[PDB]
Amino acid sequence: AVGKNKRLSKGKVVDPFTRKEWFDIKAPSTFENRNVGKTLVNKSTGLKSASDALKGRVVEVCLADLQGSEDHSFRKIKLRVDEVQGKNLLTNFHGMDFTTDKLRSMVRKWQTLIEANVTVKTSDDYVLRIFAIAFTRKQANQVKRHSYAQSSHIRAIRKVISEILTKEVQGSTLAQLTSKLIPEVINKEIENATKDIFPLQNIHVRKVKLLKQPKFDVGALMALHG
Amino acid sequence: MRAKWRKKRTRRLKRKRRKVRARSK
Amino acid sequence: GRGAPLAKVVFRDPYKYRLREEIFIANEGVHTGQFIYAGKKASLNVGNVLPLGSVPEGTIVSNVEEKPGDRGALARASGNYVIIIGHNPDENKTRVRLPSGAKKVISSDARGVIGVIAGGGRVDKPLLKAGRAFHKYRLKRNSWPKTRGVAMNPVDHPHGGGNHQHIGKASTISRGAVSGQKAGLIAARRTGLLRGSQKT
Amino acid sequence: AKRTKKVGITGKYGVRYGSSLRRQVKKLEIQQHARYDCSFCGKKTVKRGAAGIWTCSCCKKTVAGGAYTVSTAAAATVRSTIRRLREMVEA
Amino acid sequence: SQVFGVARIYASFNDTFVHVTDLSGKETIARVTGGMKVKADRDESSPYAAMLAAQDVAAKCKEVGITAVHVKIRATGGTRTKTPGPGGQAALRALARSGLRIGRIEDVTPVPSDSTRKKGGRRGRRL
């Protein structure tokens, strides 16, 4: 194990944290009190610099940490850093998804795993692929312990969910979109419009992906941090 | 011996016999 | 002498009252009476001549040139095309894939026609005869038939000589060899039949 | 009256040039000498004039295509792909 | 205060990795694997080696000043064992009461969706 290396160098010192420095992150204002944390980036040399290194960075943070609450424990978001003015590197919204434990305990036998996804874009040239998931419900006084649904019912539910999802996505920007994901308001009218077809249960929004991005947009990026 | 390997040996013998007959005729 | 058909396009001279007739390699899918738009502002249609800096990523082009003003250099044989893999704005250069598989950066001012050259899949029918090969090579050059160096006399060829038809020395020839010694394989990095995919 | 069993058009070659080459040239010659139709009229009068040139006696339109076929699978794929990029660019 | 760094613990049946990185993940605080702690060439994935590696990582993090750590466990991952290694639990337990305070326990093992083929043939292992 330890004594196994025969030779190391094919051709044939100081602690890096002295040069390493600390930089605080600032999440967009669409969330609550930020208190993101702190990252380590190498010294701002004349060739690489700290700012350009911070440009290509993403920080994974749970939504419960941002909100200062509990019911958002099983939701987490990546924050994409875009610019830094010094010790307060600002970031934006990248994507939201649940935990592996949440997904695995969500998926259970004797149920259904209706799913939907549509490739859409927002007003500000922001293309996002919105994912939606749905499970059939066992109604009260039911003795049939499988809650199976017909393929036509699945098709209709998926079509309705996609229609409402596109209606929500169209005519909105990232700030309002995130401010409406946060309180979990999509599932309300999703289940309202899909409850007639099937009772439905465990309605959540799976994940979003950031595919295409417009220009830097400093003027409105500064709005998310003051 | 296994029937599969016996059959394979039979195919090999059949190929050899066919080659011998072809070279004779 | 060329498998690819030649398309004749007439263009009005914008500085004098006359008709200037170009010589174009007939792309696959073109037909008589179809208008051909050549220029940067022209749309993306088969046969149109556009600069390489205007076509989107993944475009298939033909009759491209190494430098602007070369009147079309690369991808001029029947059934070949060039695939635009990327664009680089600063010091504008379009990264492309050639039919041979090599990737070369060329200036965005280079112009290539849209589509593939007609007559693709020319070499699938075997010549099947000496007559067809002779007629094909007669229209090209005096490069047929060719006599083997083993049957060649020893003075006529380094490989020749001896009672039996054998090379004698190594067939591979170094790049540093002088004229007269370059008889056989030249700079053989890997000799013999390759096993598996070429992975080009 | 089915004068031949399988050789077909290559019956002119007789006992020559092997069998696999004869079959390949038979298939390629069938594809070459088959008549097609002009996309501008819809009448099966398209014939082959030269290497890659498909002429007609009625539509009077010459089309540049494959050596032995009016349209090639690779050519059609390239045309569809180019149309796809054009639509993506303008939309 | 209580600056947060992630642990990125890798548990396998042959070796254990405790590679503490920043919250973003582009850092190298005490990568230290569980291979140099024991000279056995067989006991690399063992609770003792895992605990020693966790203690070394905790000491290095205390030296660097990080006090709050998140833990992201992962198994071998892929077309293979899929189960967490015995060393992961021991490393987590050792790192818990040895300095840094942990939070947001989470598993991040990558599990494919019917991709490629499992090595071993159609007849499987025949030891």
Added chain:
Amino acid sequence: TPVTLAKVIKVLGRTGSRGGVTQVRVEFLEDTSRTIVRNVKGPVRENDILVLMESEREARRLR
């Protein structure tokens, strides 16, 4: 060598192929209320104090 004197309260049973190793659940008087599972070679009864060299060395059933 940092020692830890720990008194046992419950012998789990005899482990190992040859039965020379016995499992036990043991805690230490100093800063008590936390216990670990240890393995003893010799005969061990209840209310027996043993000197552990190790602290974070939770053991496992022997073979």
Added chain:
Amino acid sequence: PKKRASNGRNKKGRGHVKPVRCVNCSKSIPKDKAIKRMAIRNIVEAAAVRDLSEASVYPEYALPKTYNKLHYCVSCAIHARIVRVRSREDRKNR
């Protein structure tokens, strides 16, 4: 002879079933023929939650679980004691 009413597994009127690979021996077996165990465990072992609670940032919280579905073949299950052989009469239960 006819050792079992169901020849391999619950496959009547279906025929071909897409196969899956065993978790350990990586042997290809029909999906219904794989002994599937719904193993729901905890990513913190026994007698460790107490030590992991007070040594964790934020009060309570955490308490997650791991959930994996293991497809054990017949030989692997017999070797690992996942399923044990029994008498002829006990086979008909469940």
Added chain:
RNA sequence: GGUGAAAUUCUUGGAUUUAUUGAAGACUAACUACUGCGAAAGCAUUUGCCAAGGACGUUUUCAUUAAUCAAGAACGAAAGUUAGGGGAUCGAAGAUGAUCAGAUACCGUCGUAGUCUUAACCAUAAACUAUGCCGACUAGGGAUCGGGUGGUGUUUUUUUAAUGACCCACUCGGCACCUUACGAGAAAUCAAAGUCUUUGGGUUCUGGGGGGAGUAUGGUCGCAAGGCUGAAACUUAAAGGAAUU
């Protein structure tokens, strides 16, 4: 990196590792069950088009147009063959390192054909439900899929119509399951393997002790490997099936 232990091999020109992006190719986990479709082989992502099929209702139509099949024809797992694209993983041959008296294998690392897709051959398997198709009858019980009918039923809506999703009762067509044996069977077991010594519903195919042998030959199809039909000479008194100690 790997295994019971090792070893080949990649490693201060960053090996493993962390984070981002891009390309490729394979597949459709978890949902996934004694559940669905199809003549069979066989089919699990979303959407659009083309049609096709089963079940149910029907006071609609023809009128016996019906059941099985020599010959013949269509489809037909995987692997293999010919000519192209692709060729990400796995990976027969092969190259090494282990173990062993020997290991050309089981074990570790690479690795061609192949694995994927297009146009054509291959016509095979434990292709099993080792159970032919059609039609009539025969102990019960529960659950489930599709369809149909009745609920002074529940819920969802717009507390209340429709539309759905549930619960109660009935029925047809299926996948099937459980206790028993009026019976069958040599038994294992079977609601069909029953209505066969109280022997007969119609009908097609296959077999007469085990080897030789699914071999030789004669034909036929196929580029090829091979596919269909298919013996005789000679030898033996046991070859076999189910259960019991």
